[model samples]
Target: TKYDGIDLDEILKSDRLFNNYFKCLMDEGRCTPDGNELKKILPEALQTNCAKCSEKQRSGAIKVINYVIENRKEQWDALQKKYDPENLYVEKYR
Candidate 1:
């Protein structure tokens, strides 16, 4: 099953929007407390308001994104740029 139509190679490219922490955790299969962070990155099903995202759902992404970084210093290299510091969702929305 493809993730929200997110191609594996598209996300694997080093220059893709995602940072190393995102890649690292994903590579390790520890992207989230759940099975993986694949579903987390995927927008909700199209059933809910034409797939429109709620603010609460958007807010939770930031929380989960942060959660992936804060407790996993050992999980990724500092040089890799943690939690995609420059590309946060709140920053994009605001």
Candidate 2:
């Protein structure tokens, strides 16, 4: 549950790495082990509004989500469509 901040920062800072993770989430590319875990939990995380997340996890997720919303709008929209078509869960972050 306690992911290293450096790792998160690294992912956001690198376009190729970020896109690889994104593509994995989108089912458009292969997932690394950690990416696969994230993909597996993403729907439930959104559905539950991250209710099960620890404070660190929630903050980390917020950081990542905000990054994508600001820096990768297209992928953000696509993710919303894929996992939250009803536009319900995403409002929590806004």
Candidate 3:
């Protein structure tokens, strides 16, 4: 959607975008980042560059990944649905 990718689907765009940010909200971005979550799928966000990711961004990703995993242990534990890769939402960016 960021780079004019097909299937933006504005009608469903809100849910799409909401779910997009929701990726890093899981697993609390702590010691172990959520490798399973689609961190960033937007064309602009997904980098194919040779340069290594900046330390700041790396730390940020870790922070959020753990934040959800550790921060929210069981408040809505049962409410959070755990969908598998097949049912995974939002394509993760690099």
Best by TM-score: 2
Model 3: per-residue Cα lDDT over 3-94, one tens digit each = 12323233123554434445433444321122332343211122332125565445444343334444444521421344223212123331
- Report every candidate's CA lDDT: 0.38, 0.73, 0.33
> Which of 2 and 3 is ahead in TM-score?
2
Clashing pairs in 1: none
Which has the better lDDT: candidate 1, or candidate 3?
1
Clashing pairs in 2: none
- Among these predictions, the greatest lDDT belongs to 2
Local distance difference test, candidate 1: 0.38
Candidate 2 structure quality by residue, lDDT tens digits, 45-72: 6666677876665666666666887888
* Alpha-carbon TM-score of each model against the true structure: 0.28, 0.77, 0.28
lDDT of 1 by residue, 1-94 (tens): 1223543334334343244336544464334332154344432311122135656554444343444345444432331243344433324432
42 Cα displacement, candidate 3 (Å)? 11
Q: By summed lDDT, which 10 consecutive residues of candidate 1 come out lowest?
A: 42-51
Over 4 Å off in model 3, which ranges? 1-20, 23-38, 41-51, 73-94
Give the range of the ten consecutive residues with the poorest summed lDDT in model 3: 41-50
